[PDB]
Amino acid sequence: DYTLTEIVTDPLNVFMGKLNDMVNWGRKNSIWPYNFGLSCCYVEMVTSFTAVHDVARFGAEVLRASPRQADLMVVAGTCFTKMAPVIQRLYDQMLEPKWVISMGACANSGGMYDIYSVVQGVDKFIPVDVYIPGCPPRPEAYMQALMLLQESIGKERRPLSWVVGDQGVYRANMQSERERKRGERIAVTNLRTPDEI
Amino acid sequence: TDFLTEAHLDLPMEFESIGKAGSRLGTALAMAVDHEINMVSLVRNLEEFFARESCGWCTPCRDGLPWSVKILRALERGEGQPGDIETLEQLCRFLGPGKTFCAHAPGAVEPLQSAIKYFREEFEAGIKQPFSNTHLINGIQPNLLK
Numbered sequence: 001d002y003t004l005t006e007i008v009t010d011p012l013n014v015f016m017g018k019l020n021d022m023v024n025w026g027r028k029n030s031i032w033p034y035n036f037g038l039s040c041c042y043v044e045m046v047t048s049f050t051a052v053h054d055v056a057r058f059g060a061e062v063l064r065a066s067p068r069q070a071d072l073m074v075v076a077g078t079c080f081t082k083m084a085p086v087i088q089r090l091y092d093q094m095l096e097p098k099w100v101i102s103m104g105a106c107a108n109s110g111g112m113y114d115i116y117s118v119v120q121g122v123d124k125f126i127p128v129d130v131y132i133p134g135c136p137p138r139p140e141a142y143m144q145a146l147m148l149l150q151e152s153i154g155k156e157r158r159p160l161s162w163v164v165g166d167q168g169v170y171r172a173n174m175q176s177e178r179e180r181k182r183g184e185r186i187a188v189t190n191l192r193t194p195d196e197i
Numbered sequence: 198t199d200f201l202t203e204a205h206l207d208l209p210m211e212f213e214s215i216g217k218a219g220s221r222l223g224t225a226l227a228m229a230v231d232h233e234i235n236m237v238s239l240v241r242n243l244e245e246f247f248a249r250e251s252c253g254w255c256t257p258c259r260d261g262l263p264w265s266v267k268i269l270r271a272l273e274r275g276e277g278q279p280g281d282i283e284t285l286e287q288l289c290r291f292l293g294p295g296k297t298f299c300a301h302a303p304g305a306v307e308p309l310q311s312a313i314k315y316f317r318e319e320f321e322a323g324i325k326q327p328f329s330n331t332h333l334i335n336g337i338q339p340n341l342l343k
């Protein structure tokens with residue numbers, strides 16, 4: 001159960017599988033996000049970058065001002081109509097492999113701003129790999145999205161070289177986190193009363 | 198008709214004479230209450246009669262005489278709460294002539310206001326519990342009004 005860019009099966013010799021696993025390990029353990037500030041969600045992103053959360057521990061603190069060196073585009077903020085061509089150009093300037101995380105309800109769907117000057121979600125014009133609900137998501141939600149992206153990266157198939165082998169990108173069809181956590185979420189009975197601290 | 202005290206016993210039984218005293222001559226058939234009778238119980242019986250003999254047409258009599266009945270029942274059992282006598286006085290001034298559809302409710306509230314005016318210590322002696330309209334809901338902090 002994969003997606004080729006069509007639903008196909010897993011294409012994965014045993015040495016090529018080990019090489020692909022090593023490449024995916026190196027890619028997921030070294031993710032360089034692009035420094036792009038749209039709105040309040042970017043403030044929570046850079047809060048995750050600071051000392052009290054330390055996103056550097058996952059190897060994802062090298063925040064690039066150049067889209068060429070960046071691997072991850074975190075659309076963290078509202079996709080305004082004037083800013084949408086800028087977002088598309090900065091996404092186009094990136095290099096393969098590239099991943100996209102929508103952070104916050106604005107980047108997910110437009111959020112509360114179903115208004116004349118807001119594009120209703122960044123998936124309207126760029127492909128998104130991981131969505132985060134929240135307005136804003138807290139910094140550890142951004143960390144959890146980073147681990148979700150790492151798990152998605154570790155099970156995708158990409159060409160090792162541009163001259164040898166199949167050049168198609170096979171992205172795994174992961175189980176939804178809603179269906180995965182439905183076992184533990186429904187079983188919750190009692191929560192702490194809000195009058196305490 | 199409104200209650201009158203022993204000071205009003207030296208008054209002629211005319212319409213205008215009882216009118217200025219703060220009562221009505223009515224049918225001129227007077228009824229005497231001695232010291233043994235608690236006035237809260239007597240006015241509770243009177244209001245129970247006047248609330249069960251309502252015709253139900255108009256709102257203040259139909260829905261305010263039973264409220265005064267339940268307040269007087271609480272005062273009889275000592276379960277009165279602060280604001281009850283104020284509620285009775287508000288009912289007396291809001292069930293007067295013109296406010297209700299007919300004259301049954303002014304005649305209902307006349308003994309109540311007269312007994313509050315002349316025998317307020319008996320009504321104040323039925324208030325023994327603090328006011329409580331709400332019970333605590335776990336997880337919700339109440340709005341502690343002052």
Ligand SMILES: CCCCCCCCCCC1=C(C)C(=O)C(OC)=C(OC)C1=O
Binds near residue numbers: 046049050056063
């Ligand atoms: C071509 C010039 C390269 C200069 C060095 C760039 C790579 C190191 C970035 C350091 C850094 C800065 C400045 C920084 O401001 C920041 O906060 C958002 C980080 O995340 C914790 C950083 O890692």
Ligand code: SF4
Binds near residue numbers: 076077111134136
């Ligand atoms: S989702 Fe909320 S917190 Fe994030 S950019 Fe929109 S308004 Fe700001």
Ligand code: SF4
Binds near residue numbers: 250253256302
């Ligand atoms: S005041 Fe008269 S009209 Fe109104 S409900 Fe009472 S008995 Fe009926």
